[PDB]
Design a protein around this ligand. Structure first.
Ligand SMILES: COc1ccc([C@@H]2CC(=O)c3c(O)cc(O)cc3O2)cc1O
Ligand SMILES: COc1ccc([C@@H]2CC(=O)c3c(O)cc(O)cc3O2)cc1O
Ligand SMILES: COc1ccc([C@@H]2CC(=O)c3c(O)cc(O)cc3O2)cc1O
Lengths: 204, 202
């Protein structure tokens, strides 16, 4: 906790904003010499996990392979959202109506792996999750995104949750580390801190 | 009539330009061209290869970072300010260049880090500009970012702008299109709309 180690983490802009922010906050107190490079999700993360060029990979666990140690962070529900200004979004929407509307969707980098949800007519593609609410605001487009993201934006961008009529989908966000680092003291320390925070979040 | 087209435009730009500028484009064309669609592409590898193959319609970037092989147009002037957290104690007052070089710094790296931003101890590197205010809030780290970005987060994330002490630095955001598309009617239509919106942003 008195180190000057630089950790490298691969994660979504969503996970950076809604979760890792807690880590940076806490450690700015508990370990003020520890630094971070947050890397964008784009290429197979495995290549970097096998070589040990990254300390951590945060991803929903369905997208990880079984060749590195991983740990459950928390459950994330996927909801369908729209702009309060949208008329059709007033009332209940039929799965048929969903597939009849214009969609905003996130494509991470070169789109190696697919969005947990994805056919819909996508009229807006963006490099992450976080730009989706602002670029959706004021149009008749809908999107499907983490429920923790909609809450982060509650006081900033009002969003109408319309998923109530469609399938209930939830994934479990998780953290993975290289097996070559399973006994690194820095790695176990950061690991345990991340899991602590994720449990706090599971309570919410 | 391109206002009734179903063309999909591909644009390369920063999360900053997506959030403070292209949003206006998407907003306006939602009523003026309800079928035109967009794929916003992240800044990563040399955009010159996508421009020389006409694989995208537009690249939005500060003009110092563009080459002279493709036609481009001035969008607007963007000031670069130094920001910190109101809760930072040593940010109450003025910050010397030496003092600045003695503090922790949050910075943006785009993709593989092929291009530098416009001797600092960078304690946090993040893949764009937009995550910088949130990840900075509540720490003693500072950053340098477009002043239009600070104004966007003014009501959500309070930030302290440090201005008087360090140098005044501003660049010019611009738009570029492939030379092979200089005549494309669709390209000119979107291009000119983009220019109109930039002028309203002084
Ligand atoms: C290697 O390329 C990829 C890996 C993982 C993803 C998934 C894709 C995805 O749906 C996703 C998510 O819903 C939440 C999250 O925190 C991170 C996510 O990333 C996309 C990619 O393009
Ligand atoms: C998956 O992790 C991330 C993905 C994208 C970002 C932002 C996300 C984003 O929207 C973006 C963009 O439009 C242009 C660009 O050049 C870089 C961008 O990166 C931050 C992340 O942490
Ligand atoms: C293809 O590689 C790159 C191209 C341009 C950049 C610049 C880097 C940069 O400083 C910059 C900016 O100040 C404003 C903006 O809107 C977009 C910017 O992107 C970074 C890259 O990694």
């Amino acid at each position: 906790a008195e180190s000057d180690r630089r950790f490298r983490i691969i994660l979504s802009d969503f996970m950076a904003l809604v979760f890792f922010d807690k880590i940076i906050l806490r450690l700015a107190r508990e370990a003020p010499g520890v630094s971070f490079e947050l890397l964008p999700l784009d290429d197979d993360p495995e290549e970097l996990l096998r070589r040990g060029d990254v300390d951590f990979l945060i991803l929903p666990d369905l997208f990880m392979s079984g060749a590195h140690p991983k740990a459950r962070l928390f459950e994330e529900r996927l909801v369908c959202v729209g702009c309060p200004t949208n008329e059709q979004l007033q009332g209940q929407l039929s799965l048929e109506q969903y597939m009849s509307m214009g969609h905003v969707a996130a494509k991470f980098g070169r789109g190696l792996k697919p969005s947990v949800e994805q056919k819909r007519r996508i009229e807006l593609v963006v490099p992450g999750f976080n730009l989706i609410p602002p670029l959706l605001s004021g149009t008749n487009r809908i999107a499907t995104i983490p429920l923790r993201l909609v809450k982060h934006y509650e006081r900033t961008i009002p969003l109408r949750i319309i998923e109530h009529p469609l399938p209930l989908v939830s994934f479990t966000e998780a953290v993975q580390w290289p097996a070559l680092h399973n006994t690194d003291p820095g790695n176990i320390w950061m690991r345990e801190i991340m899991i602590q925070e994720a449990l706090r979040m599971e309570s919410e």
